[PDB]
Design a protein around this ligand. Sequence first.
Ligand SMILES: NC(=O)C1=CN([C@@H]2O[C@H](COP(=O)(O)OP(=O)(O)OC[C@H]3O[C@@H](n4cnc5c(N)ncnc54)[C@H](OP(=O)(O)O)[C@@H]3O)[C@@H](O)[C@H]2O)C=CC1
Ligand SMILES: NC(=O)C1=CN([C@@H]2O[C@H](COP(=O)(O)OP(=O)(O)OC[C@H]3O[C@@H](n4cnc5c(N)ncnc54)[C@H](OP(=O)(O)O)[C@@H]3O)[C@@H](O)[C@H]2O)C=CC1
Lengths: 234, 243
Amino acid sequence: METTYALVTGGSRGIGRATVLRFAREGWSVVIAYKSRADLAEKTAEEARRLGSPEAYTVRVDVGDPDSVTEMSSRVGELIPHLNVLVNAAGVLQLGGIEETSISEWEETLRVNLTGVYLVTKLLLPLLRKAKWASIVNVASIAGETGNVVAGVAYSASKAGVIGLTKRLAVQLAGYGIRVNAVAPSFVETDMLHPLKIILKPEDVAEAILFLADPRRSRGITGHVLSINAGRRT
Amino acid sequence: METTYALVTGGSRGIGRATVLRFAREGWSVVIAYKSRADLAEKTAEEARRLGSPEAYTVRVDVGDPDSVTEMSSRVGELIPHLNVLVNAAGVLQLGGIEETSISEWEETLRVNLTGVYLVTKLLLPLLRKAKWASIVNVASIAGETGNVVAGVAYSASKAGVIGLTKRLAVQLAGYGIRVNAVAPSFVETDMTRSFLRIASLHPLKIILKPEDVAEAILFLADPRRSRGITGHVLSINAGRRT
Ligand SMILES: NC(=O)C1=CN([C@@H]2O[C@H](COP(=O)(O)OP(=O)(O)OC[C@H]3O[C@@H](n4cnc5c(N)ncnc54)[C@H](OP(=O)(O)O)[C@@H]3O)[C@@H](O)[C@H]2O)C=CC1
Ligand SMILES: NC(=O)C1=CN([C@@H]2O[C@H](COP(=O)(O)OP(=O)(O)OC[C@H]3O[C@@H](n4cnc5c(N)ncnc54)[C@H](OP(=O)(O)O)[C@@H]3O)[C@@H](O)[C@H]2O)C=CC1
């Protein structure tokens, strides 16, 4: 088989970083996409190489900016022959009701959390179509599933939008054999109410992302939202 | 004791228009918010008054533009004392897969269908809070509930966003006693004639969904006498295409 290549936005922290390292343990080559923490990205790359990635690259990108994403895309195309897995995990949190959410805050949240997913996926599709097999995993949130959670109105709207995008892309891209799924975690403990007495960690979400990314495990699953909330919402 | 006032965006055509007229039959005063066809909006206002609206007003607004919405809310505040019902039905269609959907096409779709609902609701909240009872009904789409439909990627994302927004506002605004729900219709006979010489065979119930069928669901969700205990719900109208 061909070498496996995975790209993870928000790959230098939280869920994205945990996902990159989980992929490395699988022997998958990785591309760590980050906005500004070049230091954290390179240190993540060094751990990925130690853990098992044949190759680990870093690439700077602002997912909410079209030009930045277009450049990242070209840059990535110069480093790898194809892309098997794309994980969009570069979302940003937002809090507050509609009265306290200013128009600029609303727009910025949608630009990064929703438009960013569409942009990264759009520009990297040619690389994904070149792979013998491919999958896409978007990191949504329980906030996109329900209003009964403390999250800003823009955050909830953007995450629900990510879920809608995930489902439509799954059906539309199924023709190319590309699977598209999402994970919807509840509160996750990072460097920033439920029946099961545990605290979700980035590594817990990474396991779920790996399951959905790997065709050996989920080849028949597409357009699904895998909820990880320790039972807060069934 | 107080007159019922309802505002409907996209009120001069399709679902919005049918809703305005159904509201008029209920004896509610209506504000017809429209984007460009001032002539059709006035015709709607006339028909509303004839049907039962004590008062019928028209207001121009581009829900995708902050200045336009802000100006619209100011004008509305000069015409009515409060607002009991808000219906956001000013959405636009978008077709195409991700490769076929240009960045600008995506942005404009989100701007109108999702950000527009947020804008209108945000600028009119003061008037809604002034009323003794209030409810918001957003028009989503089956496209926001499932990927198994023919609709563009941006359209599906924006409508799913509308549903997420609806749910969160329902929980957040419950404190003010304001209910927020959504209707999610599938194919509806409207100025989307593109699909006409099959669609009626897309569902178990062999019927043809009309704007007035959606208007009935919107009325149910808007009227507290009918749905006082319902909030944050998405009422699907698809003749069984999706259960
Ligand atoms: N924590 C939670 O409770 C939950 C989180 N999520 C989702 O997890 C995903 C990541 O969250 P989390 O891991 O906490 O986030 P972090 O706060 O750890 O950082 C988020 C990532 O966003 C990255 N980022 C932001 N913009 C870009 C960009 N434009 N390009 C590349 N990276 C970008 C940051 O990179 P840098 O700063 O270096 O640019 C950072 O690694 C998001 O989709 C989030 O919404 C979902 C549900 C729950
Ligand atoms: N038809 C279908 O199959 C389905 C439709 N829907 C939804 O129904 C809602 C309306 O669709 P439909 O009734 O067919 O649309 P129409 O094509 O009949 O017209 C849509 C309305 O959009 C109005 N409009 C667009 N922008 C604005 C604006 N900025 N301010 C005020 N009005 C605006 C137009 O008014 P003017 O041109 O006068 O400015 C028009 O009345 C949308 O949310 C749509 O997505 C949902 C599911 C299915």
